[PDB]
């Protein structure tokens, strides 16, 4: 809850958060129009583009989730709720540290989080329900990401919690609770998965 709770911002183009800015929604809900349908199609725009060092906080992203939130690194995404994930909820598009802290995501047909560049990706105090995967390192990429899942609770994970084809990436978990998931991690070695 914040001072904008009960308000909805209807957008027709991606919100760009410039480097060094924190976009604080104060509880506002964002609904994108003409930017996608939230399907898995690749002809959608992101709701948000966070330049390097931009932060986002306290927004609810309504359906359609479109192409979610494009992060160009060193971003904090705090108390963001994806009421219905689109193609994906958030994508790391450039190198850096990206932290998703608080909030939740719901109804991701595929992945919630998509890692397309080397990064440290931390998901903290987050719940997700009805998802295909929580985190996917871009398919067949072999750069390194380090994933931290800390105080993450997942419900109904169709594929796996996290998948990477990189032999060098790592996944660190601490209080990761997973209900209804056949396979936790799909990495080249279980030695890349660590508890802390
Ligand atoms: Ca995407
Ligand atoms: Ca969805
Ligand atoms: Cl990318």
How remote is the CA of residue 91 from the centroid of ligand 3, in Å?
8
Beta strands 185-186 and 145-163 are parallel
- Resolution in angstroms comes to 1.5
How remote is the CA of residue 66 from the centroid of ligand 2, in Å?
9
Technique employed here was X-ray
Q: Ligand nearest 143 Cα, by number?
A: 3
Distance CA 102, CA 171 (A): 19
| Residue 31 CB-half CA count within 13 A | 6
Neighbours of ion ligand 2 (CB under 5 A): 84-85, 107
How remote is the CA of residue 42 from the centroid of ligand 1, in Å?
7
Q: Which helix (H) or strand (E) holds 168?
A: none
User: To which residue do tokens 């963001």 refer?
Assistant: 80
Rg (the chain; Cα; Å): 15
Cα–Cα distances in angstroms (integers) from residue 41 to residues 37, 65, 87, 110, in the given order:
8, 12, 7, 11
Look at residues 68, 48, 152 and name the one whose alpha carbon lies nearest to residue 162: 152
Query: What domains lie within the chain, and their CATH numbers?
Result: 1-196 (2.160.20.10)
Distance CA 37, CA 69 (A): 15
How remote is the CA of residue 43 from the centroid of ligand 3, in Å?
14
């Amino acid at each position: 809850v914040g001072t904008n709770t009960g308000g909805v911002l209807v957008i027709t183009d991606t919100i760009i958060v410039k480097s060094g800015q924190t976009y604080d929604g104060k509880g506002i809900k964002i609904i994108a129009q003409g930017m996608g349908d939230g399907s898995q199609s690749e002809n959608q725009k992101p709701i948000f583009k966070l330049e390097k060092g931009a932060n986002l906080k306290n927004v609810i992203i309504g359906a359609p989730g479109c192409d979610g939130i494009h992060c160009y690194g060193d971003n904090v995404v705090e108390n963001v709720v994806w009421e219905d994930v689109g193609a994906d909820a958030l994508t790391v598009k450039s190198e850096g540290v990206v932290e998703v802290i608080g909030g939740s995501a719901k109804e991701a047909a595929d992945k919630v989080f998509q890692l397309n560049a080397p990064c440290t990706f931390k998901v903290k105090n987050f719940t997700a329900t009805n998802i295909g995967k929580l985190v996917r390192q871009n398919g067949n990429t072999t750069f390194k990401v380090v994933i931290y899942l800390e105080d993450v609770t997942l419900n109904n994970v169709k594929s796996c919690v996290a998948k990477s084809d990189s032999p060098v990436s790592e996944l660190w978990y601490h209080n990761l609770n997973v209900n209804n998931c056949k396979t936790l991690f799909e990495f080249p070695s279980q030695s890349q998965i660590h508890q802390y």
